[model samples]
Structures are given as structure tokens and as C-alpha cells.
Target: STVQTSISVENVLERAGDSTPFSIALESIDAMKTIEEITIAGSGKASFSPLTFTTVGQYTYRVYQKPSQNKDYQADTTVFDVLVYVTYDEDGTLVAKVISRRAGDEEKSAITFKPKWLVKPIPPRQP
Candidate 1:
């Protein structure tokens, strides 16, 4: 197996009202080294980290939200799967591609978290 210099994934966190600072984890092998504990208080964009495809095989990773201590936070309990397929072309060039999906979902999809705050301090609920 050779190496593909580039490949990455995206993590999007959805916030409705917010606490304990919305956070997420991309747990994986070698083992989840890129993001052992990263907390984002601002943008929803998360990093998956580029990996050099040194080995050719299928890799499974859990993409989910980290449990927060704030009682008001309703963290997304849904666990998503990030599958990486590494293979080599006829010229010995390793190619890496990723497919994401919600746990138990038959179709391949992208990972996105939807967490909401139970209450808001002032903004009136638009109904």
C-alpha cells in the first residue's frame, strides 16, 4: 500500500439556543488522535483532519457530539458513521474516498448534528 497525500471530512454542528459550548468528537483509530478533545464555541464547522492513506482498507469511525455538563443542553444522541475506503489505482497511486451515514441508515449520507437548547432567555418563540 502506498500513500495518498490528501483526504478529509467535514463536521457540522447545529445549534438552536446554546451551553457548555457545543462540542463534537471524531473518534477513530491510531486512535482518534486528531481530535481527542476539541470544543467549538463559535462556528459549526468541525475538522476531520487529513490522513495519508498508508494502508489500503476500510476504516470505520464514529462521528458524534460530546456529552456536555450543561443540563439545558439537549445534545444530539445520534451516532454517525464515517467510512474511509483506501485503494490503489493501476499505477500504484493510492486513492482515498469517504462515505458518511447515520447509524443504521441504509443509504450513504453526510454527517450533521442537531442539538437544541430547551429554553431561551428573551427572544419570543416564533410560532
Candidate 2:
């Protein structure tokens, strides 16, 4: 069963030079609990930052490559086909990792990292 979820993206600045462009997509989210935490993969070549959601439920996430350039900003359409899974710590802490393959461009798949979240504890934390 797939959940229907909304997807969003953001830009990350690794350092002063390397500009790694990435995007995030959410799907298969319809109902559930809460998004307590989020995790994003941080690769030297490609990086991502985790985001928080107030809504509750379960769903899958996807990370794609946005069109980018080194010296100039080009509008090239280069996306990834892989949707990696996000894991969490025992304390409901979200974490993201890099993927090696994805479904895109008719057999032209690339490694990407999908955002993942951790569920909040019932009654919330009293700290």
C-alpha cells in the first residue's frame, strides 16, 4: 500500500564554492500520526537538509537532482529515479542516507537520498 504525501525542496550551501542542487518529493501519504523529526543526506557533492511537518501520518519520500550549473545557472532538467528510505534512532531521531539507484529517464537511474521522519511520542515531550 502506497501513501499520498506532499513533496517540497530546498537549497543547501555546503561551503563557499561547491553548489550541490537537490529536490525532495513526498507521496503515498493520506493519514497517520505526526512527523516528529526529519533527516536529510549531506554529501560533499550533493547535500540536503531535513524539514519538519506538523501533520501526522505515514508516507514515503523522494529526493531528485535539480538543474544546476557551476559558474552559471542553467535550466537543465536532470532528475533522479531513486527513492531512498530514511531511518531513525531508537529515540525517534530522524536520519538520512544516500541511495545508489532510482527509477528515472527510462533506465538512466542515479543515486539520491529521500527525506525521512521520526514519529513523535504520545502526549509530546515535557521538556
Candidate 3:
């Protein structure tokens, strides 16, 4: 039995350039799936390949912000965990249960992260 589900992130940021893109790394700590690097900017989201679960077990994943390639901005350092469970449904099909845990005991439907802000030239000491 196998089940599939897609993951999405709500990227909240300011638009400074046309090519300004945001990215995050979704790594499977449990070694269920390969590392997933998601990019989302200038659009509602950057939805991509769905995560399918075949084996029945707890899936653990780490999702965090990946800094931009340039020095024009900085990203959030906050991290989140994605926990999913795979099991056979009573209706005769495999199902996937997922959740986002934060601050020890909070739940989130989607993995939304803090915004990235533009980083101008570092302010020098006042003369």
C-alpha cells in the first residue's frame, strides 16, 4: 500500500528584485526520502513532487530556511519538524497522517516560516 501527500510553505517576504527567490531544505532525518530543496517566490507557492509513503512507519523530517545565494538579504533561523505516519485505512487503502510541531507543543497545518528581509550595507559606527 502507498499514499501520497504534498507539502507547501507560506513564504512571506518583501519583493526587492524580480529574481528574488526563497528556498528551504526538507531533509528526512528518518531516511525515508531524499533531501528536498523547495523554492518559492513571486508566487503563492512552489509546490512540487508529492511525498508518497509506502512502508508503514513514522516519518521524521526537518524543514528549515536556506539562505539566499547572494548577500542582499538574510533568512530566518527558525526550524520546524514534519512528522507523518503511514498506516492502512479501514476503507482498504493506505493513508498518511501528518502534522507540524513547533515550540514543543504547537501544531501547524502548513510549514510557514518567518520572512526574509533585505540586508543593506552594514551600518558603520557613527563618527
The alpha-carbon lDDT assigned to residue 71 of candidate 3 equals 65
**Candidate 3 per-residue lDDT over residues 41-123, each given as its tens digit:** 63346653689888888888877778766566577667778888888877978889888766345566467665655665677
What local distance difference test score does each model get? 0.63, 0.37, 0.72
Model 1 score (lDDT): 0.63
What would the TM-scores of all predictions be? 0.69, 0.27, 0.76
Give lDDT: candidate 1, residue 8. Answer: 31
Candidate number of the best TM-score? 3
Listing every candidate in turn, what is its Cα RMSD in Å to the true structure after a full C-alpha superposition?
A: 5.3, 18.9, 3.3
Tens-place lDDT per residue, model 1, 11-97, is 333553332465677777546553444565533555545556688888777777777557776767777777788888898777887
Number of the top candidate by lDDT?
Answer: 3
lDDT of 2: 0.37
The predicted structure with the larger lDDT, 2 or 3, is 3
Locate the minimum summed-lDDT window of 10 residues in model 1.
4-13
> In candidate 3, where is summed lDDT lowest over 10 consecutive residues?
40-49
Candidate 1 regions off by >4 Å?
1-20, 29-35, 120-127
